Write an enzyme that holds these catalytic residues in place. Sequence first.
Site, PDB file in Angstrom:
ATOM      1  N   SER A 156      -6.267   4.655   8.100  1.00  7.55           N
ATOM      2  CA  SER A 156      -5.218   3.808   7.548  1.00  7.55           C
ATOM      3  C   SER A 156      -5.306   2.381   8.072  1.00  7.55           C
ATOM      4  O   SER A 156      -5.768   2.147   9.191  1.00  7.55           O
ATOM      5  CB  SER A 156      -3.843   4.370   7.919  1.00  7.55           C
ATOM      6  OG  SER A 156      -2.815   3.424   7.676  1.00  7.55           O
TER       7      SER A 156
ATOM      8  N   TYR B 204      -4.583  -1.967   2.863  1.00  9.67           N
ATOM      9  CA  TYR B 204      -3.271  -2.468   2.481  1.00  9.67           C
ATOM     10  C   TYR B 204      -3.503  -3.972   2.537  1.00  9.67           C
ATOM     11  O   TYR B 204      -4.089  -4.468   3.503  1.00  9.67           O
ATOM     12  CB  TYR B 204      -2.193  -2.123   3.506  1.00  9.67           C
ATOM     13  CG  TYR B 204      -1.515  -0.790   3.322  1.00  9.67           C
ATOM     14  CD1 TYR B 204      -1.128  -0.345   2.056  1.00  9.67           C
ATOM     15  CD2 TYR B 204      -1.185  -0.008   4.425  1.00  9.67           C
ATOM     16  CE1 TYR B 204      -0.423   0.845   1.900  1.00  9.67           C
ATOM     17  CE2 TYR B 204      -0.482   1.180   4.279  1.00  9.67           C
ATOM     18  CZ  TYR B 204      -0.103   1.597   3.016  1.00  9.67           C
ATOM     19  OH  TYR B 204       0.607   2.765   2.877  1.00  9.67           O
TER      20      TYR B 204
ATOM     21  N   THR C  69      -4.616   1.220  -1.447  1.00  5.05           N
ATOM     22  CA  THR C  69      -3.333   1.874  -1.697  1.00  5.05           C
ATOM     23  C   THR C  69      -2.423   0.857  -2.355  1.00  5.05           C
ATOM     24  O   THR C  69      -2.128  -0.198  -1.791  1.00  5.05           O
ATOM     25  CB  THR C  69      -2.719   2.404  -0.408  1.00  5.05           C
ATOM     26  OG1 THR C  69      -3.595   3.390   0.148  1.00  5.05           O
ATOM     27  CG2 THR C  69      -1.368   3.048  -0.695  1.00  5.05           C
TER      28      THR C  69
ATOM     29  N   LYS D  30      -5.644   4.192  -4.972  1.00  2.00           N
ATOM     30  CA  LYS D  30      -4.680   5.228  -4.614  1.00  2.00           C
ATOM     31  C   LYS D  30      -3.245   4.850  -4.951  1.00  2.00           C
ATOM     32  O   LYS D  30      -2.862   3.682  -4.870  1.00  2.00           O
ATOM     33  CB  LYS D  30      -4.804   5.502  -3.109  1.00  2.00           C
ATOM     34  CG  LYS D  30      -3.807   6.486  -2.503  1.00  2.00           C
ATOM     35  CD  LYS D  30      -4.244   6.819  -1.075  1.00  2.00           C
ATOM     36  CE  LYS D  30      -3.315   7.812  -0.384  1.00  2.00           C
ATOM     37  NZ  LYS D  30      -2.056   7.191   0.108  1.00  2.00           N
TER      38      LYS D  30
ATOM     39  N   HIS E 267       2.589   9.055  -2.730  1.00  2.00           N
ATOM     40  CA  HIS E 267       2.715   8.757  -1.310  1.00  2.00           C
ATOM     41  C   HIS E 267       3.549   9.807  -0.581  1.00  2.00           C
ATOM     42  O   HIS E 267       4.322   9.484   0.319  1.00  2.00           O
ATOM     43  CB  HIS E 267       3.362   7.374  -1.151  1.00  2.00           C
ATOM     44  CG  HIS E 267       2.894   6.605   0.045  1.00  2.00           C
ATOM     45  ND1 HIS E 267       1.981   5.576  -0.044  1.00  2.00           N
ATOM     46  CD2 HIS E 267       3.235   6.696   1.353  1.00  2.00           C
ATOM     47  CE1 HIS E 267       1.781   5.065   1.158  1.00  2.00           C
ATOM     48  NE2 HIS E 267       2.528   5.727   2.023  1.00  2.00           N
TER      49      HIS E 267
HETATM   50  C1  LIG Z   1       3.579   9.837   8.404  1.00  2.00           C
HETATM   51  C2  LIG Z   1       2.921   9.375   7.167  1.00  2.00           C
HETATM   52  C3  LIG Z   1       2.307   8.007   7.140  1.00  2.00           C
HETATM   53  C4  LIG Z   1       1.598   7.538   5.978  1.00  2.00           C
HETATM   54  N1  LIG Z   1       0.920   6.317   6.028  1.00  2.00           N
HETATM   55  C5  LIG Z   1       0.097   5.908   5.025  1.00  2.00           C
HETATM   56  C6  LIG Z   1      -0.824   4.755   5.161  1.00  2.00           C
HETATM   57  O1  LIG Z   1      -0.859   4.113   6.189  1.00  2.00           O
HETATM   58  N2  LIG Z   1      -1.702   4.522   4.059  1.00  2.00           N
HETATM   59  C7  LIG Z   1      -1.740   5.269   2.785  1.00  2.00           C
HETATM   60  O2  LIG Z   1      -2.478   4.990   1.957  1.00  2.00           O
HETATM   61  N3  LIG Z   1      -0.867   6.328   2.686  1.00  2.00           N
HETATM   62  C8  LIG Z   1      -0.047   6.663   3.686  1.00  2.00           C
HETATM   63  N4  LIG Z   1       0.704   7.887   3.622  1.00  2.00           N
HETATM   64  C9  LIG Z   1       0.588   8.703   2.391  1.00  2.00           C
HETATM   65  C10 LIG Z   1      -0.549   9.732   2.448  1.00  2.00           C
HETATM   66  O3  LIG Z   1      -1.770   9.121   2.315  1.00  2.00           O
HETATM   67  C11 LIG Z   1      -0.422  10.789   1.358  1.00  2.00           C
HETATM   68  O4  LIG Z   1      -0.241  10.111   0.060  1.00  2.00           O
HETATM   69  C12 LIG Z   1       0.802  11.719   1.456  1.00  2.00           C
HETATM   70  O5  LIG Z   1       0.994  12.118   2.814  1.00  2.00           O
HETATM   71  C13 LIG Z   1       0.514  12.926   0.606  1.00  2.00           C
HETATM   72  O6  LIG Z   1       1.602  13.899   0.635  1.00  2.00           O
HETATM   73  P1  LIG Z   1       1.807  15.073   1.638  1.00  2.00           P
HETATM   74  O7  LIG Z   1       2.311  14.467   2.937  1.00  2.00           O
HETATM   75  O8  LIG Z   1       2.819  15.991   0.978  1.00  2.00           O
HETATM   76  O9  LIG Z   1       0.464  15.741   1.805  1.00  2.00           O
HETATM   77  C14 LIG Z   1       1.505   8.440   4.719  1.00  2.00           C
HETATM   78  C15 LIG Z   1       2.153   9.767   4.783  1.00  2.00           C
HETATM   79  C16 LIG Z   1       2.812  10.271   5.904  1.00  2.00           C
HETATM   80  C17 LIG Z   1       3.321  11.651   5.778  1.00  2.00           C
END
Ligand SMILES: Cc1cc2nc3c(=O)[nH]c(=O)nc-3n(C[C@H](O)[C@H](O)[C@H](O)COP(=O)(O)O)c2cc1C
Lengths: 353, 353, 353, 353
Positions: free
Chosen positions: D105, D128, D153, D228, D252
């Site tokens: 990330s 990002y 993203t 994404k 997300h």
């Molecule tokens: C704690 C947390 C932090 C996240 N931070 C980011 C990030 O920095 N960049 C990004 O592209 N998605 C981010 N996401 C989204 C994830 O890439 C992903 O889309 C999402 O967790 C998918 O759903 P799930 O948690 O049900 O598997 C984050 C999700 C969680 C749970």
Amino acid sequence: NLFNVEDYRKLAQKRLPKMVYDYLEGGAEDEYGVKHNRDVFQQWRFKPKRLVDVSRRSLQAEVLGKRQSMPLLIGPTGLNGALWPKGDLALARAATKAGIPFVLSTASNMSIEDLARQCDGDLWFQLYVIHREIAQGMVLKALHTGYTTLVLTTDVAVNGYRERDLHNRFKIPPFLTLKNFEGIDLGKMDKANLEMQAALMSRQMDASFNWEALRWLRDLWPHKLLVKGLLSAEDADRCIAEGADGVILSNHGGRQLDCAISPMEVLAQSVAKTGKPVLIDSGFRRGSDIVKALALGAEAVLLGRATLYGLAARGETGVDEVLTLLKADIDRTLAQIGCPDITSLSPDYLQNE
Amino acid sequence: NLFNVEDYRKLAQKRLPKMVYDYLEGGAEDEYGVKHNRDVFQQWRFKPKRLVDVSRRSLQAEVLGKRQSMPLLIGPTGLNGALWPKGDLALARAATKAGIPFVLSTASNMSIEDLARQCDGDLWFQLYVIHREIAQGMVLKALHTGYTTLVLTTDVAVNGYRERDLHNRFKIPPFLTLKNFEGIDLGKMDKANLEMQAALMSRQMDASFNWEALRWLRDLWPHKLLVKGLLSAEDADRCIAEGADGVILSNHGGRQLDCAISPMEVLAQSVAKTGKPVLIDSGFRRGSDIVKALALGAEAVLLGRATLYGLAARGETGVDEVLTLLKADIDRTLAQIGCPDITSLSPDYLQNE
Amino acid sequence: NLFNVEDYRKLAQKRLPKMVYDYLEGGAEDEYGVKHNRDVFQQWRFKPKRLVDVSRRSLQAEVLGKRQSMPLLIGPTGLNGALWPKGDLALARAATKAGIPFVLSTASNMSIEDLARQCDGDLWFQLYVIHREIAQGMVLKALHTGYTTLVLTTDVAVNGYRERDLHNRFKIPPFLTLKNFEGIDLGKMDKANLEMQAALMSRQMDASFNWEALRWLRDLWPHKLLVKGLLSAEDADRCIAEGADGVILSNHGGRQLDCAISPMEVLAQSVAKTGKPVLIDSGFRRGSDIVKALALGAEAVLLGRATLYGLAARGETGVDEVLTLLKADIDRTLAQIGCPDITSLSPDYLQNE
Amino acid sequence: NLFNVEDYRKLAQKRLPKMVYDYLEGGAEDEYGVKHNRDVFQQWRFKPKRLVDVSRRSLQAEVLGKRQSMPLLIGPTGLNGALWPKGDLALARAATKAGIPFVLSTASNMSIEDLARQCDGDLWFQLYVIHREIAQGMVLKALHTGYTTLVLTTDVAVNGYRERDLHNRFKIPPFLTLKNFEGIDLGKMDKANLEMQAALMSRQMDASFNWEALRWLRDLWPHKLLVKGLLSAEDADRCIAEGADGVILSNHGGRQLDCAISPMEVLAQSVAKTGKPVLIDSGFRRGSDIVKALALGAEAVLLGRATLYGLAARGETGVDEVLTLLKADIDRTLAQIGCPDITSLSPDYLQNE
Ligand SMILES: Cc1cc2nc3c(=O)[nH]c(=O)nc-3n(C[C@H](O)[C@H](O)[C@H](O)COP(=O)(O)O)c2cc1C
Ligand SMILES: Cc1cc2nc3c(=O)[nH]c(=O)nc-3n(C[C@H](O)[C@H](O)[C@H](O)COP(=O)(O)O)c2cc1C
Ligand SMILES: Cc1cc2nc3c(=O)[nH]c(=O)nc-3n(C[C@H](O)[C@H](O)[C@H](O)COP(=O)(O)O)c2cc1C
Ligand SMILES: Cc1cc2nc3c(=O)[nH]c(=O)nc-3n(C[C@H](O)[C@H](O)[C@H](O)COP(=O)(O)O)c2cc1C
């Protein structure tokens, strides 16, 4: 209070050790499957036909061309001895007293031969193939001892992920034994009698058993042959094309694949496509569930947990009681919907919800 | 707080012995039916017509060609005396004060004759046939005492499996009596007066009563005849073809077959197919439930438990109160949806959900 | 924690006497309506448009041809003074600070004149007709004091059956007064000034007010005229045909007819059929609810309980806070779905569920 | 008991401070989105193909033309160090041991360079854009250090309204640092190095990043590029038209827009329309969820919270365990539905519910 199947489930839970009750009641993973198996019956409601003479009713019906007291069977369930002493015999005798077939599991606690010697009812044998040679031995044994029908269960290519068993570290009761595998020799050293010994020392079925293998089984067994565990009209049709005399639509009572469809979802389609006997199980608890399946074309319904609750709660008498209640239930339902002869059931008595 | 039917149910539960309340409230088997009877009303919502002059509203309507105060009736319910002393009379007098018919049950605690002598309202008689000869006697008695309409209930060919009653070992209150079967002689020895005596010593109706038998009843009764317990437009249509003046779509308040459809599911179809009066019951509690049925074409709605809650909670006055609340409820609803004359209701005021 | 509308509802419930909170929150009969008003929004989900420049967003929009800060309004609600001292003024000043209209209720606790003298925002007047002569007086008063828009509420021909109020024996707070009816003289003896006095001594509106009467109102009021309480595209269309400049689809926040459809069910149809401004209220709590309605074509959304929670919990500042949160909510939502200009919203951003 | 992902969630909740667990588990506003993300999987059930030789199964599959052990990836999640020390490295090493890619990330706690130096697996970089110049720096850094794939993203144009964080006044752990923004100089005085410094002193992304900007990024990055956060086949198609090598359908994890559709709702359509790799995430917890997406055409599934539960509960080993369980889960499911080669999955194994 013992007025329905649920009442027996409640009593069974009170009398069985938790580990055993969980082995019996549990389903795969989240258990959304067992719930769906029950809920799907609410997709249909009854549209009774009034002013029909139902003073004389008949539950008698032919299953695979052979007449029996009612379109029910006690299906194959393994380790029945863990639920009640000599459980396999108790179930068989109850089925026989009720005038319906009993299906012995490959994983039974009473041998194919011993059951045949102690019960003169219509006995069916359910086969699991771990090793081709061993399977042939069991099939021939069932043939020589009078079993009328052979059922191949195809939905346990690999073991289901039942988490209750994992939490309880479920272990086959020490006082129990997979009797049908008894005396399968040892000491023999060479490919087979080694590849076989290894197969038996593994709790995994022959995952390679396919259509070609079914052809082999078809040639080995001379009587009625059914394939169990199907969940599509296409597979049911292929089974008939490959020689089967009928099929048993089933998801193994939600014990193998949590997200599997309920066999009720493909019952009508399978009946229409195959044109051959389509039996079914998975989720049946009330007479209304049974009548709905029969109305959709099912040849017969096999009971799994329903009669096991009777067995676990009150042994053979418990099974007799559950069958008596279900028979009275089916009879009552037929009278109420205006279909005195169970063989006259049709989709016209149902309303899709 | 007594502002609706549910409030009376709550009070009735507090005043009735558990056994009696369960007899009243209970349904068949899992009681999914009574729940469905209530839930089905949510399949429709209202689309009011605004800016309609509703300063003058009318609930008056013809039922079977005869005008009454509102399209409601107190339907036939047995053992009313177990809910409140002289319950049958209390209900009849309340119905009469409200300007609507009262239907006496074959299983009433007050005789056909006694009620007719103590109430000058529009009395209907509901018939159950246990023995043809006895049924004829009751029908003729109802005819000679001034009953205007005959209702044949066809949905109790066999008794419903109500498990609350089984748990409570429900027994007809000792101080109660099936008055209509009183004095049906005895001592008489020979086929009838033996086949009859045996029939009366059995809690089971004549399960053979069919269309041919309905023809017999049609010739015996000279006035309006309705067939109750129908759950299909086809059966409703056949009833009209066989001589009936109308029908009552009903699943007996979910007390007979748990998986039966709600009559609301075939109301519009029955209205369109028969072209004759289609009355209905089962699940009605709010004025909105009633208005929805009337909008779909129902000639009138019969109340079962709704008025029985009033009876069990506060006797005759309780029934008066429930009818008053329901009338004000229906009136209020008509004003709110912009249909001042209840006879102008149509499907246009509804939205299928 | 005050981060959304629900948080203010929670605080309002803690600060208001139960009787008052129930008056505010309660719905008709079973309250299935208020629940449906909330649940219906889940029938739509968003399909964001990605990679759209949303660095510059605009919530500004024309309502009835006049630009305002955002497509929201504080709708007409009676007895605001029971929720917070000088509640009508608090709401009006908050709306004005937010750049949106405020609609004064005929049943307000602050007079038409007094509000106009103490608030320079865009003031709308909501009319209830109890007596034609009195209604004319209020309309002319609103006209002479600068009210820009007139809203006729048509869904209270009779009072809703709100059972919480019945249980609490709800009585208009003694320190409160229906200010708009103040000084409507008396002593006058003759038809009117008698038929009028009697009308005022009755908590019931003129149930005869129909389309013909709307024509009368249309000729009396020279500015924008909206008809509120419609639940069908047909009625909305008729209103336009009769002279209305737009309509407000609404079920009065589920306070009048429990089984009424949600206005969201006929929003798109009304927009397509009328081709005129279609405003809406009933059930709006989240910015997403609002954006869904706007995407379906709504000209603007009127807030009822949402801002009243702010008022009851923290007075004028509370209303300011709720409007601030909702504005930030709508703005955030627009950015997230890729629609920077609120006037560009369309059904393409939604997925029917 | 650690037999599935939920078991790890339970353990993670017990070991993490409430504030951190809420940061991890929480969703936007009412959290109807995260619930919908889970519930949508029940819209499909399996129709196994029986009598298929599944003795030899393969989970190996090409993702963007490159073969990996199974169609899974550990997706980009920020602040992993708040869940477990050196969380980014733990996840990366676990992914590498499992034979699948790990996506770093932009908001990671370990720098792009440091991770590349300590892990030789297939590393992807998620971008990002807060400031164009800074973004270019990170992209070039990822390019020079061996990252194979770039993921843009696009669904955080503005920050999601996560109310748990608001209630907890969530603040990035003091011992944590957004390492990738370290050393981005200062002191520099003039437009950039001022407009940039200001951008970094703001927790808000470049909301203006649009299709034109994507073209810029496409020219900067020479290897595989995925977009994404898409929730429509139309946007997915446009991404391909603009140069992307594939897309990641995602909401997300329900953390940005509560009412967003689940990407599963547009998966099949996106696969059919784009004809290019369609990866997906959001809501995946069971192997069955994953298999359903793959059967609908998904190239691969990215894990978010599932592996984070393993990380928060038991660090690197926990992640290894979760991946091991999921792999065995997928394998078991393939055997059970009769699809030995994961690349042979198709919609034919599913039943729409
Ligand atoms: C704690 C947390 C932090 C996240 N931070 C980011 C990030 O920095 N960049 C990004 O592209 N998605 C981010 N996401 C989204 C994830 O890439 C992903 O889309 C999402 O967790 C998918 O759903 P799930 O948690 O049900 O598997 C984050 C999700 C969680 C749970
Ligand atoms: C305790 C238990 C053991 C089982 N063992 C076997 C078995 O050995 N052979 C087989 O073919 N099916 C087996 N089954 C599946 C049943 O034959 C049947 O498909 C299932 O019980 C039907 O669902 P129901 O339990 O809801 O009636 C078993 C089921 C249970 C409940
Ligand atoms: C306590 C009780 C006794 C009943 N007895 C009779 C009866 O004797 N004859 C008959 O035709 N229906 C009988 N019914 C059925 C009613 O006529 C009616 O179909 C049913 O109550 C309608 O549903 P509801 O209770 O939801 O209003 C009975 C219902 C109840 C609740
Ligand atoms: C306490 C209360 C009093 C109301 N009084 C009036 C009124 O005087 N005039 C009117 O047109 N609507 C009245 N309404 C209805 C509102 O204008 C609006 O239709 C309704 O509140 C919208 O639903 P909501 O509360 O879910 O936002 C009232 C609503 C509430 C909650």
